Amino acid sequence: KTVFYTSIDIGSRYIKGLVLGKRDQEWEALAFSSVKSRGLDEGEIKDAIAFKESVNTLLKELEEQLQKSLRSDFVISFSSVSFEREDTVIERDFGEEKRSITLDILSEMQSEALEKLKENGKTPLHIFSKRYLLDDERIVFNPLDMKASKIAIEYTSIVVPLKVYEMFYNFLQDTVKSPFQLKSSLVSTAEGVLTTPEKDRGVVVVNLGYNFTGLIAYKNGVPIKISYVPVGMKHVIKDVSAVLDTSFEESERLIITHGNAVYNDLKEEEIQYRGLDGNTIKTTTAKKLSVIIHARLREIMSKSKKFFREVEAKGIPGGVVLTGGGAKIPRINELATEVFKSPVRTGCYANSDRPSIINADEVANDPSFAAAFGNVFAVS
């Protein structure tokens, strides 16, 4: 039997869809597509009508490719500036009795934790067992099948204000014709591009998103910090449009097709583009475009450099993994290496520890689909 794993990644610019099939442990990419996101500046959906259709267009495209009808459970991730880390510990005392830890005991405890994390108007999207202690002072890597008299588990969780949660939940409930689970797009991205030795030794994931740049760091298998910089790709595009009387659409087209993270060695070859709201065709050079881009990019990083240090107080054995649309700008890793002074690589599903899904060559190598993959594996 082929069990289906549907996944949606709601971004401020694009909504990515993906459907994976597991059969014998035969991960395959049965369907996938991307669509222009609508109805939300970001964080908030300011036009649920426009937004709901964007999600339906995606759903149509997906169902069509599958020559089927999606009725399986969905895993939907979305981006927010309000995601944050929260911990909680849960303990059990079986008295003098020396009970053996089973999966049941572990899920009860994780459930106890989920409840506790639901407070202060926040609600957990991801939970990670951080450490295990059997009857005070015996750190184990896996408590399962071990007999203890007492057990304490510290959990790390990524939470969101239920205010934001409701917003997405309500609208998606009237669009997705099946139950689902919301997830952080930043955490899922990390889960879909990182490697175990990386999540373990220490690594920083820098998502070069649209409205902002997301920051998340892992150490010892779980995230230890998460934040962002209020500077994203949207700003690089505003910059290009400002310097060149061009429109925002034309600005993005240029960035996507001619942009480069290193301008110093480019040729001054001519590049044409339509002026602001007119046929008036104007012209720039390859180098001038990249000069405008370069500035914005140096800011984004130089600005997220304090995060690098802030976590350094708890790791670059893994360096930085760049993901998101920005990660696709040519030679951006080269710019990042100079700014962060550490090893920099591009994140995508292919360069991860994760299973080598079959028929899935383009999206698995696309940084923009990282989260889509993460959503599925950030579960089972």
Ligand SMILES: Nc1ncnc2c1ncn2[C@@H]1O[C@H](COP(=O)(O)OP(=O)(O)OP(=O)(O)O)[C@@H](O)[C@H]1O
């Ligand atoms: N191939 C590319 N080369 C360079 N820049 C690109 C490329 N593809 C996309 N971008 C840039 O990335 C932006 C989209 O970023 P991204 O794909 O991270 O957005 P998103 O997932 O919709 O947003 P969010 O960060 O809220 O999840 C575009 O506005 C564009 O400027």
Ligand SMILES: [Mg+2]
């Ligand atoms: Mg994204």
